[PDB]
Amino acid sequence: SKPFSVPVLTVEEMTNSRFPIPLEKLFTGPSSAFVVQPQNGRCTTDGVLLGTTQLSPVNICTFRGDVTHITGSRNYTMNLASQNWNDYDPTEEIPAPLGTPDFVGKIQGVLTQTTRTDGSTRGHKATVYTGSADFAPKLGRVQFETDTDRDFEANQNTKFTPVGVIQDGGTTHRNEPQQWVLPSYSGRNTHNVHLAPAVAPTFPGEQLLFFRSTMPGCSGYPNMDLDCLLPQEWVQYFYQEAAPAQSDVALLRFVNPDTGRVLFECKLHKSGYVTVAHTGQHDLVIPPNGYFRFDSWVNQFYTLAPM
Amino acid sequence: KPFSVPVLTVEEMTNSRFPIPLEKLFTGPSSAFVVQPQNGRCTTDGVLLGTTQLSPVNICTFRGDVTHITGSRNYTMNLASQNWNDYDPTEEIPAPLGTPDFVGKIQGVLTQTTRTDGSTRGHKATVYTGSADFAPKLGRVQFETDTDRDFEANQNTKFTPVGVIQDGGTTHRNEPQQWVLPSYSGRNTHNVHLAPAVAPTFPGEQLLFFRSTMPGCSGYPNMDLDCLLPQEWVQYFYQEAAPAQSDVALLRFVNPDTGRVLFECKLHKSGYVTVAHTGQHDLVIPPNGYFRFDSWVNQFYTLAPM
Numbered sequence: 001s002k003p004f005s006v007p008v009l010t011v012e013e014m015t016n017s018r019f020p021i022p023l024e025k026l027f028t029g030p031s032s033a034f035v036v037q038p039q040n041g042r043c044t045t046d047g048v049l050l051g052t053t054q055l056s057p058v059n060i061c062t063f064r065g066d067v068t069h070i071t072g073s074r075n076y077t078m079n080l081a082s083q084n085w086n087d088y089d090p091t092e093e094i095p096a097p098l099g100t101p102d103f104v105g106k107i108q109g110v111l112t113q114t115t116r117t118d119g120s121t122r123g124h125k126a127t128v129y130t131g132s133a134d135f136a137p138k139l140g141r142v143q144f145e146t147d148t149d150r151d152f153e154a155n156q157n158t159k160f161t162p163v164g165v166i167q168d169g170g171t172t173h174r175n176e177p178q179q180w181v182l183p184s185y186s187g188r189n190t191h192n193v194h195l196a197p198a199v200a201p202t203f204p205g206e207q208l209l210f211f212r213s214t215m216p217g218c219s220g221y222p223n224m225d226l227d228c229l230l231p232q233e234w235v236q237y238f239y240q241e242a243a244p245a246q247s248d249v250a251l252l253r254f255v256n257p258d259t260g261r262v263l264f265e266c267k268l269h270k271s272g273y274v275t276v277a278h279t280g281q282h283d284l285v286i287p288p289n290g291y292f293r294f295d296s297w298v299n300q301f302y303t304l305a306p307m
Numbered sequence: 308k309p310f311s312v313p314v315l316t317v318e319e320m321t322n323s324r325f326p327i328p329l330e331k332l333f334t335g336p337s338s339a340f341v342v343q344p345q346n347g348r349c350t351t352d353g354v355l356l357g358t359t360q361l362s363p364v365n366i367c368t369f370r371g372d373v374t375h376i377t378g379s380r381n382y383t384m385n386l387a388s389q390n391w392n393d394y395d396p397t398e399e400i401p402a403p404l405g406t407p408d409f410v411g412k413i414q415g416v417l418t419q420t421t422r423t424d425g426s427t428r429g430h431k432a433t434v435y436t437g438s439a440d441f442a443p444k445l446g447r448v449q450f451e452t453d454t455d456r457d458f459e460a461n462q463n464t465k466f467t468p469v470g471v472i473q474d475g476g477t478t479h480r481n482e483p484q485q486w487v488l489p490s491y492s493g494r495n496t497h498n499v500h501l502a503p504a505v506a507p508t509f510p511g512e513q514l515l516f517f518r519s520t521m522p523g524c525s526g527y528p529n530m531d532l533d534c535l536l537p538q539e540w541v542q543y544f545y546q547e548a549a550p551a552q553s554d555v556a557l558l559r560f561v562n563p564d565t566g567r568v569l570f571e572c573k574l575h576k577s578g579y580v581t582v583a584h585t586g587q588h589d590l591v592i593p594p595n596g597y598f599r600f601d602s603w604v605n606q607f608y609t610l611a612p613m
């Protein structure tokens with residue numbers, strides 16, 4: 001039976017699994033009042049990828065395909081290809097293409113394109129509104145708002161590189177993005193399919209432990225908070241190890257290597273998320289070189305020490 | 308601890324010199340120029356070299372505060388560390404970790420947040436790593452942007468890289484130059500603490516490159532980008548730190564579908580790969596193919612022609 005383990009990377013060394021930026025901190029808070037059902041950063045401890053999760057940290061919230069100009073506008077519809085430029089299959093048993101954004105918001109970035117025959121290239125500021133009626137990645141199409149009505153060519157490889165998020169400054173501050181509201185992946189008036197399940201702590205006194213980043217903001221007053229259930233490196237690690245789960249819960253200790261001391265302990269649930277014994281919103285204060293270590297598999301009644 | 312390499316496929320892995328996926332394996336001669344990249348540099352037993360760090364998404368990013376150059380749309384960034392700690396120029400490295408390791412014009416976006424009210428802004432930005440004022444080692448780099456007033460002083464500012472550009476009115480694909488290192492402390496300075504240049508030593512052997520195509524944002528750039536190790540291999544070795552039993556690790560590239568070895572190669576302890584081939588060649592491989600460590604070999608092992 002291959003032993004289970006987690007990477008020895010520090011929080012700052014690891015990557016958010018829901019946007020291509022580093023982790024900054026560990027955060028716990030209550031979540032009874034909203035649905036925690038992210039589709040990126042979803043992986044079982046024995047390495048089965050779930051939702052829209054894929055292995056590349058840099059392909060998260062990227063798009064590739066060809067673009068068609070929406071006449072009379074600076075908008076373009078992208079006909080999606082897969083990450084390796086192969087055809088996208090809309091019948092695949094997934095919510096949307098792997099790495100598709102899993103929150104409702106306005107993501108700003110850059111659309112780049114290369115003309116195959118002469119190698120000429122171009123790049124333009126572009127925004128994708130994932131709450132848009134025309135955000136339908138599951139169907140293989142998404143709409144980009146750009147600063148040109150003529151520069152992009154048809155039938156040429158085009159990429160969207162994400163940078164950050166924006167908000168309307170003339171409306172309530174930090175009201176968008178909404179990190180826990182899933183897009184409708186097939187556009188307006190449709191129901192999402194094949195979702196990784198929503199997660200919640202069940203044990204008394206426990207809350208989710210989030211791996212938190214701050215998304216860059218590009219305009220207005222966005223809510224830049226972004227919480228993922230697992231670091232991308234953990235997804236990569238579990239996928240590779242494929243260590244069988246001996247119980248439903250892996251007990252982890254967060255340790256200071258300088259002192260050999262446990263700062264706190266937590267439960268890594270087999271279906272791919274972490275809980276801690278704490279009540280309320282709290283930014284964890286940790287030593288920068290601290291990291292997680294697998295302790296042992298525990299039964300369903302194990303009680304965590306307060307953190 | 309036994310040595311090993313990841314079982315990830317080439318397409319599943321990431322370029323260690325720019326934050327984009329690997330696309331293919333490529334081999335070619337390199338006797339006539341210096342191959343001395345500073346990112347994607349790691350020994351098989353887990354020692355990081357050059358400007359190499361672990362995060363794939365921090366490669367070619369910059370963070371700090373910016374000062375406006377009056378009479379211009381250019382800004383000087385006073386660099387901080389990736390975690391917003393003070394940058395220490397006395398640290399024994401060539402430059403801040405993840406600094407670009409080639410001379411070219413990198414286009415991206417400068418973003419900023421105003422601490423007090425959470426107001427935010429983003430602007431097109433280019434950094435010319437061959438510029439006299441490109442001095443990341445001293446803690447300063449210059450960005451050319453599309454604004455002369457929007458960025459504030461003393462506020463956290465980040466550069467997210469997107470791609471490279473070229474001047475279309477000059478010879479096509481003449482820039483970037485992926486094998487020309489910047490002068491990290493600016494014009495008329497000498498680099499320090501570099502990861503060494505690499506070359507095959509065995510007769511008939513060439514380097515094996517892990518190749519990507521950088522996005523192009525304007526003109527006719529040379530978008531080829533070759534790294535010596537995937538970023539995931541760097542990550543793997545750093546954590547495993549498995550002792551090297553010799554200077555050369557024999558790898559087999561195998562198809563899990565049939566079990567046939569397409570080819571074998573040498574993973575050198577100091578962190579690069581060679582193969583038995585003469586000439587330029589894009590390798591044809593199956594997407595589900597991967598590398599497997601078989602054994603440690605001595606200095607005299609002759610590779611099967613590839």
Ligand SMILES: C[C@@H]1O[C@@H](O[C@@H]2[C@@H](O[C@H]3O[C@H](CO)[C@H](O)[C@H](O)[C@H]3O)[C@@H](O)[C@@H](CO)O[C@@H]2O)[C@@H](O)[C@H](O)[C@@H]1O
Pocket residue numbers: 168169170218219220221426427428429457
């Ligand atoms: C909160 C505010 O967000 C950004 O300003 C935007 C405006 O952006 C436009 O004007 C600004 C200068 O005010 C700048 O020139 C930018 O390049 C340009 O696109 C505009 O989108 C309005 C419309 O609602 O919203 C905000 O005022 C940012 O530029 C500011 O620095 C500031 O953070």
Ligand SMILES: C[C@@H]1O[C@@H](O[C@@H]2[C@@H](O[C@H]3O[C@H](CO)[C@H](O)[C@H](O)[C@H]3O)[C@@H](O)[C@@H](CO)O[C@@H]2O)[C@@H](O)[C@H](O)[C@@H]1O
Pocket residue numbers: 120121122123148151475476524525526527
């Ligand atoms: C080869 C060429 O590169 C890019 O064009 C640039 C020019 O970029 C400016 O004009 C173009 C239209 O040609 C476009 O409107 C763009 O938004 C704007 O910045 C310009 O930088 C010149 C200067 O010598 O070089 C190129 O012509 C690209 O936009 C084109 O599609 C094309 O690939």
